[PDB]
Amino acid sequence: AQKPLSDDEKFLFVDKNFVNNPLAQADWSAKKLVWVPSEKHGFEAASIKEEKGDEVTVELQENGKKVTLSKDDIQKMNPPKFSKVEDMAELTCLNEASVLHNLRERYFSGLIYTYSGLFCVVINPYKQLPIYSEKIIDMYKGKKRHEMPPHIYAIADTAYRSMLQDREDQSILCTGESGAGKTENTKKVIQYLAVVASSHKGKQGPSFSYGELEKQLLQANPILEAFGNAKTVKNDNSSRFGKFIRINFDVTGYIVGANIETYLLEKSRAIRQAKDERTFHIFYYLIAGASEQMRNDLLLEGFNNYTFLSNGHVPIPAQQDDEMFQETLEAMTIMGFTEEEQTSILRVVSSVLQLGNIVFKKERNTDQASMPDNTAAQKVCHLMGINVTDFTRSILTPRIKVGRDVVQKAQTKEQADFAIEALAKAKFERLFRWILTRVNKALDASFLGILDIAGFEIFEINSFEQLCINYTNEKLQQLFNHTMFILEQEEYQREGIEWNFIDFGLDLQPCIELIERPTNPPGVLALLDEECWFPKATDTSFVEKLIQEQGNHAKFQKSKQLKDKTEFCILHYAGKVTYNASAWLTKNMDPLNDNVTSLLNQSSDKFVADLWKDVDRIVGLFRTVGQLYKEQLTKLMTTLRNTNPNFVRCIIPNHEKRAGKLDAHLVLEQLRCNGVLEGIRICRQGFPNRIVFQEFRQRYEILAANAIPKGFMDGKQACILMIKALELDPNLYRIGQSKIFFRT
Amino acid sequence: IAGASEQMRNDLLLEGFNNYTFLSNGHVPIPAQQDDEMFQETLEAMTIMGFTEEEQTSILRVVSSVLQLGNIVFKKERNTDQASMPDNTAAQKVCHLMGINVTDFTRSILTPRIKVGRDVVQKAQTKEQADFAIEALAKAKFERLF
């Protein structure tokens, strides 16, 4: 009976304009209508016919087939009115059958994001839905949530608003597997603040005049795609990196500081390419676009006459390394690298060819390996703003100091060509993070933290790069649980407030243990930290130690007999993956040498002094990559613990990259994985917010001038006066001992 | 509490003698001075010095919020041990004579979004930590006043 809804705006507002049918009210006569289990629909519709103790001959009202089923299988039927709803928590009947059901008929109408009590579900459409421009800023601008339907700019204001209100320091974390949509629901928030939270020299579609700091703010991505991507078996050009932002605010709340961080790289192949694979883009290009003159000047050895351009020249389908030389030479200029820097990035071809060569090639005789090329270190440390001798010294001999004993010693290949693969590829990483420095430099009471996860994946050859990819996912996931199940109901016992305890079985820590648990029987990372520090230890004995320690665990699985390849299939929250272990040992090691970290801490040049002032973690006695990246994710995860986790929970419909295609069982897998039904089952029950009764008495005495008359009593009862004089409901609040627990 | 006129008796938020815990020995009388009228007197004396038409009631309020703070009782909620505060007029009558932020008084007085090192650190306060700090606040407001 309302207005016609726009064709577009159907993707924002529910199609409400349907028909007053009597059938939905007559049909109730079939009073044993129930939801029943189904592999294809998830659940479906049936009716009890005959009560056999705990069985009942239930009968389908789709197929008509009698199926004797149990009192516990049959799940309560929801009323027709709840179709495709705005919040999932409204469904009177919560039970898996139907908590699943809300999404299927919804996404196909256009309606992607949906509120689910505390968190919000954000499925992928794979379609350019028009829901952005200053129309959608200023529609949603400064907006109390109820006036703007379930879509992203509501989370974005609610960050900026709450921070100046409840004054929790707010954060934004986007979750869910690969493709799902996280990267992009991060960038859109930078668009939001650049106009809204900034300030203005005085003062539509894309157009408005943002300030100066706010203009610089954007121009980063296109370079790292050449010097970082490399030809695989799955994809001849796939990326391998993933990111974060903090946003510091002044006294008045404006954008003042902004701090971007990226996490880890496929940093390994340069000195081991598999048969028919290729290396980092640019090498092949410098040999190809090689004019004779700079073939002599830039120190070019020829096609195949290389240590580790394996498989000779493997070509590439539909790309020609020749011309691609020029295009990828062009990109570096935009956010700003000079020609000193670029004759240097020409010898950063010589430095990624020689970061195929700054590797302490396993020294067969002594075992503790050493630096092949001076010129390579010379290229490197000058282009990391420290010193070249001071580097290599430390990178062989840590000149550390415990007690009397100046712990001066050699590092092994694994130790030294780890702190120098952990710095050939924290050259490739903290120099990827030097691109990140060249941004943050112009970018830095209150702050906003935001996180673009590298998204849960399955290659065929998964490796530490993916061990971490489907670790961040998993690590963020036990944050979610501890925040939203356990600690919650603990406080529910506490306050004197009526609520009985429910357990959900949502400690996903068992898969996370299975990777991350240091003591007790250790998991993948912990066995590999130990194995990284180990001579008797082969990527082989890593998987042998994994079978040895884990084996029988109800989230773990061996290889498909390929002990020979040495690989392990595991149940992570979102099901299963195979990792392969060849050359993993080193990939867990990063023993962050403080000798270098401190020269980097006290570095001179425009490059480094900023990005290494994170001196805390560093080996004063200590950490690996596995550990470092548990810890980097703890610098994140435990200050995230002490911020507000606004989660933007992205959900995959298909693995077929397709428009349209949902699979309800793939989604139902990712619901059990994301811990959805139970994240909704807590937030239906209790009371998300929590504050005391004074937030009642003050801010509204103005609202009802008569409310407390001559005389005063207890704060609870006195606020209860203006409370009932503004009709505030006896279960909307929970006036507890200290806290008013407030619902949604 | 004694020479309250019925309008500012309910405005400057007056309950009777011994409804403040921080006034001990009940109400001890004084010889040959009766606090009752001595109120009215000092109020005159204000107008002679030129304490303003509103200001007089403002000095009286700061006083009375100090009088108020000691209704803030912390009961050992013994399943964190990091226990919090039942009544609100305890804080309310305090913070209507304060006008600070009502939300944030208690949310500070229970969760210090504080500072360890040089950044923001959250902690819930214990019963013990919450009592002692609020106590300091009660008294310190009277000093700021003088």
UniProtKB/Swiss-Prot annotation, chain A:
Modified residues (N6,N6,N6-trimethyllysine): K127
Transmembrane segments: none
Positions of region (Actin-binding): 633-655, 734-744
Disulphide connectivity of cysteines: none
Positions annotated to bind ATP: G176, E177, S178, G179, A180, G181, K182, T183
Residue ranges constituting the Myosin N-terminal SH3-like domain according to the UniProt record: 29-79
Residues in Myosin motor domain copies: 83-744
Subcellular location: Cytoplasm, Myofibril
Domain of life: Eukaryota
Subunit structure: Muscle myosin is a hexameric protein that consists of 2 heavy chain subunits (MHC), 2 alkali light chain subunits (MLC) and 2 regulatory light chain subunits (MLC-2).
Protein family membership: Belongs to the TRAFAC class myosin-kinesin ATPase superfamily. Myosin family.
Free-text function comment from the UniProt entry: Muscle contraction.
Domain remark from Swiss-Prot or TrEMBL: The rodlike tail sequence is highly repetitive, showing cycles of a 28-residue repeat pattern composed of 4 heptapeptides, characteristic for alpha-helical coiled coils. Limited proteolysis of myosin heavy chain produces 1 light meromyosin (LMM) and 1 heavy meromyosin (HMM). HMM can be further cleaved into 2 globular subfragments (S1) and 1 rod-shaped subfragment (S2).
Name listed for the protein in its UniProt record: Myosin-11
Full-length numbering of the shown residues: 3 to 778 of 1979
